[PDB]
Ligand binder design. Structure first.
Ligand SMILES: [Ca+2]
Ligand SMILES: [Ca+2]
Ligand SMILES: [Ca+2]
Lengths: 269, 269, 269
């Protein structure tokens, strides 16, 4: 049996303020529903999910969480944005789908602090935020999704990005290139071309082919289209080159979103 | 291999008549498609599913079966209403999804009588009813869904309902509060608040979050949102208090629908 | 990890030409995305999937592949048509859904030639065709879907078709009767009526009930509505009669599509 709780009131919710959603340790957080009003998702900046003071996932703005859910075609409602720790799209290969989905839940056992920090923009009309938690029996943090932010400049022609962090033992579920002039992209590991120079229209067709929604000004490289976690990129230590070849038509700075995965560690990624 | 059969003609289908769909014993009924015309679903009153003369499930009107299917976002077609014994939304935890869904099928082995009784309203224009059965190999009644009806007066303020039947060994998949002025509800068992006083808007958001459709003038407490049968309320013999705290804005009569579950017994619930 | 490749250019793509998509042997083809322009799907005739020179699946026109995907409610996009070897609708009974779906992938190991032949109509405006492959680790051809074409005369009244090929050990996933005047159909094996004389409206309701789309001028007999491969017709070497009783209202020649299934054999069906 799951428990639906109305989280404690968020302290000091005001424009230009730096607030935090301190989660009580002990149980597992499958989903966290954040209700907002008097402020836009884009006005909720620097969203960070921290476990024991260490960064887990980061969102430039709350709007990126809305887009993250939209991509998987999850239920979107105005005035509310959810933090889906449990991945509903997961499919089991040697275990049930339910087990594969719940494995991403935010367990808090052994944790000292679980927080969701963010800053309220100064222009916020009259910010009002509350949260509801869909919890289950306690478990260790364990397997978690680690959304990381990276900013790289793009040229008009070809741009190569090979300096992406490769935490050993971790995996890469997907890579999102946020740019308005990306025509085609190619992904390779150690010379091996896992993703040919696919045109945007072709890449976007495959995405939609798997029930995903194409995000505006974004080139998504989904490594878990089938929902199989073992299809994701395994950051094996012996890997010598993890490269991305981007064919752009504009000279701009792109925001590269990398969805990492791995067993959460006190001293890990 | 399944068998699709055109059930025998329904005897005496006329306005103001009391008809019955007598099902032949021997096999398993996964789904029963009831075609209707010259009558409205609301004109088909007191729908009772009886096994060996005992009541299994009850519907005030056929319209409640239409709403039951609509809630799960099942295919709805005008002129036809189906009895989904097999629950398509079920997900397996230690077994396959298919096994978890088919486990609810209406097995008839060992039964003496299997009937679907109902009364045709007098205002019925020109009632015409036929049925089709989607069957499979015979099995005992076994695990079945037992829809029960309850009527309780709801006040403007706070009302508490703790006298709901607690058949030992049985489970509760969901509870539907049919009232027009329900603002928030709270569910608890033995003091433990499994469902905080959740506002309708918040409760309805979680429901939709799991692919469910919100029913008009209804507050649904779904204990199987994930499709996992083990998330439902297990009516343990030791439970001392099963309470519901309803915050209404109107003084009215609510129809409380309780979806029970358990292994069918000739002398059980 | 899967590999998305831009297949080699299709040789001699012109109106009235006979082209072929020669697939490199070694890996497994889960899906093949065929992009087309300057030609209609109906202008791409006699589509044949050949393994070692032998016929596996056949499509009168590329439009039949579009309808095949539409029926399962797969993502349809103008200018592109995919060959879904892996069946996304598959559900596991004693194995995971993923295993049951991927089991249909087009493995090429041990093969000498893998081709997708077709003829470009003479009326083609300015045909332009390219292909992309979603591949995975190599496997033998193994379990494959074998779409077969049959033409039979339907009468206005009742027609019976009992001369359908019954390859031993193979299965039948579905049968599609392409005719404009089919009212009802009945399916039986050895006298046993597995599908009663179901009216089109009733048959089509069950189809939609399982997330399928009804095709125009087609009576589909889906034996895998639940996604369970074990629900399909097992062509037992002991079946004496496999009959189809069609109640038509027109006198026309129907195109009977039979989706066979079985482990591909160099000297088999
Ligand atoms: Ca976890
Ligand atoms: Ca049962
Ligand atoms: Ca295969």
């Amino acid at each position: 049996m799951r428990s639906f709780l109305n989280l404690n009131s968020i302290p000091n919710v005001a424009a230009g303020n730096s607030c935090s959603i301190k989660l009580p340790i002990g149980q597992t957080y499958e989903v966290i529903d954040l209700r907002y009003s008097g402020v836009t998702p884009s006005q909720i900046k620097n969203v960070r999910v921290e476990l024991d003071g260490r960064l887990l996932s980061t969102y430039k703005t709350l709007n990126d969480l809305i887009l993250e859910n939209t991509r998987h075609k999850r239920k979107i409602k105005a005035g509310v944005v959810s933090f889906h720790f449990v991945r509903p799209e997961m499919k089991g290969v040697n275990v049930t789908d339910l087990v594969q989905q719940r494995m991403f839940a935010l367990g808090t056992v052994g944790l000292t602090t679980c927080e969701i920090k963010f800053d309220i923009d100064e222009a916020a009309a009259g910010p009002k935020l509350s949260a509801i938690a869909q919890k289950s029996v306690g478990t260790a943090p364990s397997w978690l999704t680690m959304r990381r932010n990276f900013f790289k400049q793009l040229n008009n022609g070809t741009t190569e990005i090979a300096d992406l962090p490769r935490p050993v033992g971790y995996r890469i579920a997907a890579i999102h290139i946020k740019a308005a002039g990306v025509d085609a992209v190619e992904f390779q590991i150690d010379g091996t071309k896992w993703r040919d120079l696919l045109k945007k229209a072709d890449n976007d067709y495959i995405l939609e082919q798997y029930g995903k929604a194409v995000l505006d000004n974004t080139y998504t490289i989904d490594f878990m289209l089938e929902g199989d976690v073992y299809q994701s990129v395994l950051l094996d230590q012996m890997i010598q080159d993890l490269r991305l070849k981007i064919d752009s038509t504009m000279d701009e700075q792109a925001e590269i979103i990398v969805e990492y995965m791995g067993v959460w560690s006190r001293n890990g990624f």
